[PDB]
Design a protein around this nucleic acid. Structure first.
Length: 52
RNA sequence: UUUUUUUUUUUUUUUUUUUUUUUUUUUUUUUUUUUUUUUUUUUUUUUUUUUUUUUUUUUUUUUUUUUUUUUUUUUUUUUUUUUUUUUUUUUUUUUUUUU
């Protein structure tokens, strides 16, 4: 269901990686769970993410 | 290995003794750490007796409203990758015993 014209405002391009797929989608999906937390003491989910 | 009082020279056995002694008593007197005399509330000028009082007052109550120091919405293990579950294990051993 290709979206209508709401294309985001991009920025400049950094150094080309083409290899970070081993962590970057996992990092975003785990950051979703970290954002779902509500206690600062329960921010050990972030530490578990970094350990992972 | 050997041993088994952290016993022992032989003597001895009151951390007793010159002799004399025995109130860490005594000059003789004495014996309220009493006393000039006379006194005896560390009472008193006369008044006086709420460290009461201007009058008025008397929630150190009140603008009107109000009355979870509740609430975006959604929610409700300050659970979870999967797998697991002696903060057990080389093997051999098992008085931190022995000449």
């Amino acid at each position: 269901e290709d979206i209508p014209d709401g294309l985001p405002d991009g920025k400049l391009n950094a150094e080309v990686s083409a290899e970070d797929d081993a962590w970057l989608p996992l990092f975003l999906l785990g950051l979703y769970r970290v954002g779902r937390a509500s206690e600062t003491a329960y921010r050990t989910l972030l530490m578990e993410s970094l350990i992972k």
